[PDB]
Structure 1
Amino acid sequence: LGDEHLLGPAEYISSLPSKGVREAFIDGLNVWLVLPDHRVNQLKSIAQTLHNASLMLDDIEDHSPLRRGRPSTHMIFGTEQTINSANFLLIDVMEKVRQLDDPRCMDIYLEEMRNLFIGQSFDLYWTRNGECPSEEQYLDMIRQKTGGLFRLLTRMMVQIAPVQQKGLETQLASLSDVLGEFFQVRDDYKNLTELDECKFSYPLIHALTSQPKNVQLRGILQQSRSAGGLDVPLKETVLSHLRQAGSIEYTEAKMGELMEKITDSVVSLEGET
């Protein structure tokens, strides 16, 4: 009888350093959508809890000993305990969407969570069975796996917005989608420029698509799967193979286009309001 073993993984990950992208996003959306401070704090708590649950889960499914320079939650509590505590945070958040005083807030939650789970399922399937997805297939997974939280927060925040502003929905959903795509392409580029778990990325797909006969890359990508992780000399070989096909420049062009889209969307949004 107690909660000392349930809210231990939840509290450990909540005491770690963080960036605050998910909360600055709410703060930035609060400009066009005037909201009471209580509702903004509630949404911030919901976003933080969901992000913590996601971080807890995608560490066991990535065999990552460390997290922001400190050991992972499952490495201090256990895999089963971490899973049990992460499955409970979904129920806990379910009690907070009910405190937003709107029946429609649950439909948005139950739809966007389904979308996030579909995206993560596709990611997990491509990770387990080493099938390289196409560029279009990859870009729709991360529009749900990563941009799911942004859309979820946006749609519960134009709903509690005082009357008037409900038509300004599609543009913010597109903005959230572009943000989710950009925050994953940027992470892939950062991870490569500055693998071990054999996770496909936007630069790594172009190399495997443009060069159908690259037998070295397709073998170094399988040694990682078999052994469990690449050593530094093989990582340098992967980077050298990617620097030949021009995948990095392709990633930079994609990031530039994404940023142009973000600027255009923001400009239009201030143009209306």
Structure 2
Amino acid sequence: LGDEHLLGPAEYISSLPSKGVREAFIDGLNVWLVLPDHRVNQLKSIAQTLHNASLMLDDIEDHSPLRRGRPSTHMIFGTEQTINSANFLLIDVMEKVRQLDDPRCMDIYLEEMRNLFIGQSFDLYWTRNGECPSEEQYLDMIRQKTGGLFRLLTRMMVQIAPVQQKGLETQLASLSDVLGEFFQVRDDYKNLTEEYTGQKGFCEDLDECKFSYPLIHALTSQPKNVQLRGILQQSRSAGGLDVPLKETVLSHLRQAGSIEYTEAKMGELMEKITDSVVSLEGETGSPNWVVRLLIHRLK
């Protein structure tokens, strides 16, 4: 009787500081769609709960002790309670999705969340079993894991918006899918050089043998790089890589142009994002300045 434990891992991670991107995505996508304000404050609560449930399970299946410096949710409330609360959140978004008063908002939610777990299943397989993804397979996965939430929100904004802008779903979803790729590819670069070191960890993708766009190129360009594949196997069998080992891993990546390859694809992603933004600015005819400052902050 009384929750007091179900809404305890789900209220701890909401308090933690956020770098809110999805909230800005919804608020900057409303200039083209002009949705009633009460409805916008609902589509932003779905984003928080859905994204917060992802972080709970992500940290569990990374063995990450920290999140934004402050301790992770599975260290304060345990692993078993965190998993139970994460499952509850999908049920809560179900109640929240229902009160949007649209029967096809439901068909979007179940359909889109099926692809969000299909992409996540492949990521866990490649990490546990050590199978190296191809470049084409890696790009497919990140499009349905990171762009899954952007796509889910984009198609729900269209359905519940005034019908005077119903001929945009094709392009607006294409922008979300490219924007999904740019976030994980940017994260991979900000994890390998020196940048992302305190929020989640220094080269944490190496510790859990998580593959990235840089690492895939090095493992494919050099079929006989026995040194690199041994360090990664050591990571998979000794928890993680100590500081001397991680430094060597970077040395093998700058020696094959993996880091320079990422700066080539990253720009292309941003380019496509901006390119589409120019296109929809000529149709709607209202220069979206909320997304252009967001584009600048993203760089």
TM-score by length of 2: 0.90
Q: CA RMSD in A?
A: 0.9
Superposed CA offset, 1:46-75 (max 9, x none): 000000000001000000000000110000
* Aligned-residue offset at 1:221: 0.3
Give the whole-Å Cα distance in 2 for the aligned partners of 1:185 and 1:59: 19
Give the whole-Å Cα distance in 1 for the aligned partners of 2:170 and 2:221: 35
* Aligned-residue offset at 1:270: 0.4
Give the whole-Å Cα distance in 2 for the aligned partners of 1:166 and 1:248: 41
Give runs of ≥4 in structure 1 deviating > 6 Å: none
Q: Which has the higher contact order (CA 8 A, sep 6+)?
A: 2
Give the whole-Å Cα distance in 1 for the aligned partners of 2:119 and 2:165: 30
* Aligned-residue offset at 1:231: 0.2
**SS at the partner of 2:166?**
coil
Give the whole-Å Cα distance in 1 for the aligned partners of 2:10 and 2:152: 21
* Aligned-residue offset at 1:209: 0.4
Superposed CA offset, 1:62-105 (max 9, x none): 00000000110000001000000000000000001100000000
**SS at the partner of 2:263?**
helix
* Aligned-residue offset at 1:263: 1.1
* Aligned-residue offset at 1:242: 0.3
Q: 1:148 and 2:148 equivalent? A: yes
**SS at the partner of 1:185?**
helix
**SS at the partner of 1:97?**
helix
* Aligned-residue offset at 1:206: 0.1
* Aligned-residue offset at 1:259: 1.2
Give the whole-Å Cα distance in 2 for the aligned partners of 1:13 and 1:172: 30
* Aligned-residue offset at 1:164: 1.9
Give the whole-Å Cα distance in 2 for the aligned partners of 1:167 and 1:136: 30
* Aligned-residue offset at 1:39: 0.5
* Aligned-residue offset at 1:165: 1.4
* Aligned-residue offset at 1:260: 1.1
Give the whole-Å Cα distance in 1 for the aligned partners of 2:112 and 2:58: 18
Aligned residues: 272
Structure 2 gap ranges (5+): 193-204, 285-299
Superposed CA offset, 1:88-141 (max 9, x none): 000000001100000000000001100000000010100110011000100000
Give the whole-Å Cα distance in 2 for the aligned partners of 1:36 and 1:208: 50
* Aligned-residue offset at 1:163: 1.2
Deviates most, 196-205 or 164-173? 164-173
Give the whole-Å Cα distance in 1 for the aligned partners of 2:33 and 2:63: 40
**SS at the partner of 1:121?**
helix
Give the whole-Å Cα distance in 2 for the aligned partners of 1:241 and 1:218: 11
Structure 1 gap ranges (5+): none
* Aligned-residue offset at 1:186: 0.2
Superposed CA offset, 1:191-225 (max 9, x none): 00x90111000000000000000000000000000
* Aligned-residue offset at 1:166: 1.4
Give the whole-Å Cα distance in 2 for the aligned partners of 1:100 and 1:168: 20
Give the whole-Å Cα distance in 1 for the aligned partners of 2:170 and 2:121: 26
* Aligned-residue offset at 1:226: 0.2
**SS at the partner of 2:211?**
coil
Give the whole-Å Cα distance in 1 for the aligned partners of 2:267 and 2:92: 39
